[PDB]
Amino acid sequence: GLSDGEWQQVLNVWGKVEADIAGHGQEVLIRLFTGHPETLEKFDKFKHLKTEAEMKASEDLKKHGTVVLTALGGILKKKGHHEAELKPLAQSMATKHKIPIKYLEFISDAIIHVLHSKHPGDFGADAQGAMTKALELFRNDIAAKYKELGFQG
Ligand code: HEM
Numbered sequence: 001g002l003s004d005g006e007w008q009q010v011l012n013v014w015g016k017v018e019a020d021i022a023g024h025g026q027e028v029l030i031r032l033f034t035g036h037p038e039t040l041e042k043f044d045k046f047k048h049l050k051t052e053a054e055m056k057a058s059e060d061l062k063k064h065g066t067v068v069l070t071a072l073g074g075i076l077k078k079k080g081h082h083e084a085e086l087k088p089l090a091q092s093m094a095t096k097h098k099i100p101i102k103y104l105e106f107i108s109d110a111i112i113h114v115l116h117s118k119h120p121g122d123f124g125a126d127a128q129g130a131m132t133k134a135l136e137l138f139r140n141d142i143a144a145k146y147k148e149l150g151f152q153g
């Protein structure tokens with residue numbers, strides 16, 4: 001779990017994301033796709049994107065970044081009390097989309113990276129630590145649902 005102070009840091013940082021959710025969502029997916037091109041292959045609707053210029057130009061990629069960070073932000077605002085929201089998300093990621101838990105680690109690290117890139121000097125050690133714990137909790141809770149299903153990849 002996260003402490004009260006840690007949750008407040010998380011949601012303080014998330015204010016930055018909410019001021020430009022589509023821009024943050026776009027940069028997160030680009031970082032994921034460029035750092036880990038295997039991840040692009042899980043998206044039939046993005047595997048036409050050969051270059052980062054094509055990614056940056058894709059309005060549908062920004063639209064999906066919005067969908068992703070909206071879902072994450074709603075879960076974050078539950079401050080760990082997210083079983084109802086997280087369970088069907090997890091089951092969809094496993095059974096529908098076949099997303100290995102490693103890709104969830106990749107995108108967690110990508111969120112941290114984009115935060116530093118967009119807010120250099122304004123995402124301090126306490127903020128990063130809090131966000132990291134929140135993303136770990138998210139990832140670990142999804143991992144429990146994956147184990148229930150026997151899902152690996
Ligand atoms: C913060 C982590 C994530 C969140 C909150 C998230 C959320 C969502 C949501 C809300 C949808 C649409 C609803 C659904 O189909 O269940 C979706 C679709 C999808 N997600 Fe994710 N996702 C995450 C991470 C990932 C990762 C790491 C991958 C692959 C590497 C992935 C691949 C997909 C794909 C392929 C779809 C279907 C897209 C389409 O054709 O419309 N997601 N995600």
Ligand SMILES: O=N[O-]
Nearest residue numbers: 003004005006007
């Ligand atoms: O919640 N104060 O660590």
